[PDB]
Amino acid sequence: YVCVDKVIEKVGLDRFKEQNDLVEFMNQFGKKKMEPMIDVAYRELCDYMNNREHLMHMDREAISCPPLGSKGVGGFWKAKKRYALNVYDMEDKRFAEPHLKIMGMETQQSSTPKAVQEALEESIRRILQEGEESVQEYYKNFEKEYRQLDYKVIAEVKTANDIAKYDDKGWPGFKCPFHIRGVLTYRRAVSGLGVAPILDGNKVMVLPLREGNPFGDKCIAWPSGTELPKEIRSDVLSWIDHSTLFQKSFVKPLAGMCESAGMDYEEKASLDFLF
Amino acid sequence: MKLSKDTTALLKNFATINSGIMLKSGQFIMTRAVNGTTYAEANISDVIDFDVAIYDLNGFLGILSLVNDDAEISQSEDGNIKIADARSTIFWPAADPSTVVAPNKPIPFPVASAVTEIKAEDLQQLLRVSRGLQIDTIAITVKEGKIVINGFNKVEDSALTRVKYSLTLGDYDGENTFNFIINMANMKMQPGNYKLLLWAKGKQGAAKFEGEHANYVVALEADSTHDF
Amino acid sequence: MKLSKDTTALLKNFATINSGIMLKSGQFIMTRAVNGTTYAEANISDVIDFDVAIYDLNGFLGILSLVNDDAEISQSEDGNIKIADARSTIFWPAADPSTVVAPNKPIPFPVASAVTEIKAEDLQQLLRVSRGLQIDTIAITVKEGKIVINGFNKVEDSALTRVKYSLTLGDYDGENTFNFIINMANMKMQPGNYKLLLWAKGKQGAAKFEGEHANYVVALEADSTHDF
Amino acid sequence: KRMEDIGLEALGMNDFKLAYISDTYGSEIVYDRKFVRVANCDIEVTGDKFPDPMKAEYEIDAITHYDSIDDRFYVFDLLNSMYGSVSKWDAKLAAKLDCEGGDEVPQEILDRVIYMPFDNERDMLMEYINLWEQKRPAIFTGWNIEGFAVPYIMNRVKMILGERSMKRFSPIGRVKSKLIQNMYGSKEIYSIDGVSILDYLDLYKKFAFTNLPSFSLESVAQHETKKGKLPYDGPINKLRETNHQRYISYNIIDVESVQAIDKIRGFIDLVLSMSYYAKMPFSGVMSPIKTWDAIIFNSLKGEHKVIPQQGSHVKQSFPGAFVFEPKPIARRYIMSFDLTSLYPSIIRQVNISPETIRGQFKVHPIHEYIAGTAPKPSDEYSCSPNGWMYDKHQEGIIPKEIAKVFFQRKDWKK
């Protein structure tokens, strides 16, 4: 994936008024650069190897370019085989609007829910194409929108096992697992609510809580396919800790790309107000 | 050249603000934060002959404190800083201006949206209890007609809703309310009677700690609010 | 609460025994070691309006020392601790009494086998020389016919026979012999003179330093002997 | 064996089915895809816990077998199970829209659905056995079939009817169970001697060059045909007891979705093409080694040559892929490209067939060849960076096969 931007600035970015013109120019540059250069860079290797003829040759399969007139990065590089690009033309299949080619990140990883998957892919598009303030605004918008989202999807799926080992008279014991801790808190809260108890081997959605809740613990867990009891649903919802979950499900990735793209994911310094 | 003890104190405060320092010719000292969040400027009685960039201002001040107050500091023949005392001569190499964040001009402060007064003891109490109460944010706002400052722990509550330590600044007679947020790792004032000048239009907004010896300017995190 | 500086110093010295505290509503302060090896009591003049549990004492006292002594301390609307100065307030969190380890009932000392008295400079000498001389245990005993002290190095001398510090505590008119063994770290007390109440029975024994402001009680390890 | 143990080499093919098929036909063969019976299967099992294919403890209540030449969706339903008896499926009700109580099965599908209910398990399983007998599939596929379908059906017929009826699946009465699936050693595969099991999940996984977050049938079906199914509620385990109707209809669209994918990809046409181009049994498509052995043997036999005995070597892993080092930097203008058939092209660069080795030469540091500072390893003989040396005028058999296949691909693109 050779990175060639010098030719663009060398020719003069002002010459190009549309993304299509830049794409066409760099396509002609690739056409004039590939065949002679690759032929000369392989004929010496062919005579070194002493074969009948060098079949070995590349092409100009893929291109990528940040949209013209915008301040997006275009393409960054988070880790080995973990990156994103804004491809305009795959193997002479031109796209009227650029298509994002993404891999490595959690956009395709099913450990996180699907809503945050859409949110990550949209954020990736924004950073690649739009620019900084767009990502800041989208951050703030989603951050506002995440709090009132339904508690079912934003609850972590866990497996409830060997509960009796980690309980101490209905209270957390030694090395109580986080999901098991939430199950114990649920059992304490639903003590006298007439609900079916959580069974070993069942699946539970876990909603963590902030320190100091009346339940006296940092998490709760409720059985698979069911809802929180109406009596304690409001008390839980008013006391849930979505902050650390949001960061784990959405903030984590931006940190990597922005640190690897010369980008910031939230700003709290001026640099403007002064000189 | 010759520097007074108060001048060296201002240089040490600027070193706390930023490791490096620009010393242009004149009677003014100026240095901005590495990230540019804070800016410290002051006017000194002494004059300066030549501009110089110092990477290690604190170490240079430590060296300077060991010699007479009347030692002369000038440009050495080897491209460095020469300090001549009555009996001793010190060679401190001069740092490159490009390797240290360099200010250009002091900011002509516009009309302040709010004017407030703070005393030395109250500010010292604020900064001292900030470490003990692990406070990282302070919100300056209006509560029952009183312009006040309040402490907020950002880490445990990003919503900035947990009051931990509130200090009342003074009276505020106006319906133009505001909540301006400061990060504790920015302001580094010297003790003294200081005045706050707060300016804001839309997203734009900054604060100014003006004092008898030096004046500093600090930024506002975007979640600051203001209706004027 | 309006507290005096002397009370702050006394309860600071108390904080060494236990990090937390349970200041019950009343007039009497009382702490026990976390491992239950040393108890400390005192009576003050500032009445306690409500019970409060404090996790970190040292930070609380650091905050207290940086405000006016007339700042009124009470319980906030959320059950926390609100201390209001003349023009400021501080919200120190209040812990649950369950998590903070505190002694349950006020402790009386029944009777001493041989009541003695120790002068302030004696304990001061002992405490400054314990660290320098690398001493890890001490013994109060009868030698020559008089009650004396003996410093021992358990680390090297498992027999605790290598005396390093010796000082005749006083006279001894009786027939009961004893060798109480205590560790200097186990005994933490304010600089001052004290009255020793020393009692024993079977495997179990007591030493007590009664003081003009606060009284301490330390235990005696199994190596202690007492013949009556 | 006897010429092996005397330390002498025997040339030709140890395998004999390939020899028989190559000798019997010889010339290139033609075929009509319509004649070969391609069967599709899918099964739904209601169970308290995840039905485990290896143990097969739960009961089968849903079997949909799609026959190609008869072009029929045979549906076997179990009415009176141990999970409570249920009503009988209705075609016209299912064809209707879901709001009135239907399941939105396309009408042409119900035009071919041959539905049969059964009161007890033994009768339904025996009917499935005799349906297999009457219309023996020639290639028997489905989505994730060797993982959940084939094992479950065969374990259940063994645990209910006995091995004497379990072995009735094959036309030659031989159903041998292979145990390994050495990747994690988790599951077991089955082999019915006479029908070529070909798991459609593996066919898609290997012959698509596409990556998806999940390879479950639903997501890939949505990707391919843009046709999901109506959302449902509750765990699947209770569906049979809530609205069993939908249950059966659910499975009926399940088998079709796969057929839809076939109609978009033509995968079974591909498997027929490869099998009849390599003159080899169907299942060998799963293994590239068998395919290549078959084609190279057929070409060499057409050239009057003999293949050597399969030499026994130990496993010596070699260094993997040269991955470049990425600097975590944003690159705005980045032109990316990869060459075509890198390894196949190199195969003609060094002509590496077993007879083409010609010795070794003096080995330089690899960086010398990277910078080109090393001199020519040989002038009249070809050079490779591994210190080894190969002929230039004698074309290898492997390069000849590469040339033939590449020419065929170019001709067929034309």
Author numbering:
A (entry chain C): 623 to 897
B (entry chain B), C (entry chain D): 1 to 228
D (entry chain C): 71 to 484
The authors write:
The T4 replication system centers on a holoenzyme complex that is assembled from the DNA polymerase (gp43) and the sliding clamp (gp45) loaded onto a primer/template junction by the clamp loader complex (gp44/62) in the presence of ATP. The sliding clamp plays a crucial role by encircling the DNA double helix and anchoring the polymerase to the template. Sequence analysis reveals that T4 polymerase contains three main structural regions: an N-terminal domain, a 3′-5′ exonuclease domain responsible for proofreading activity, and a C-terminal polymerase domain. The T4 gp45 sliding clamp forms a trimeric ring structure, with each of the three monomers composed of structurally similar N-terminal and C-terminal domains (NTD and CTD).
In state 2, both thumb domains align at equivalent heights. DNA interaction is restricted to the left polymerase, where thumb residues Arg-704, Phe-796, Lys-797, and Arg-803 engage the substrate, while the right polymerase maintains no DNA contacts. The primer 3′-end occupies neither catalytic site of the left polymerase. In state 2, the DNA occupies the central region of the clamp channel, maintaining proximity to all three Arg-131 residues from each clamp monomer. In both states 1 and 2, the DNA substrate remains displaced from the polymerization active site in either polymerase, with the primer 3′ terminus positioned 16 Å away from the catalytic residue Asp-620 and the finger domain maintaining an open conformation. During the transition from state 3 to state 2, the duplex region of the DNA moves toward the clamp’s central channel and becomes less severely tilted. This shift causes the primer/template DNA to disengage from the left polymerase and move 14 Å toward the right polymerase. Superposition of the right polymerases of states 2 and 3 illuminates the structural rearrangements required to reposition the DNA primer from its inactive placement in the left polymerase of state 2 to the catalytically competent configuration observed in state 3. This alignment reveals four coordinated transitions: (i) further upward tilting of the sliding clamp relative to the DNA; (ii) downward compression of the polymerase thumb for improved DNA engagement; consequently, (iii) P/T DNA rotation that shifts the template strand laterally by 16 Å to optimize interactions with the thumb; and (iv) finger domain closure to stabilize the incoming nucleotide.
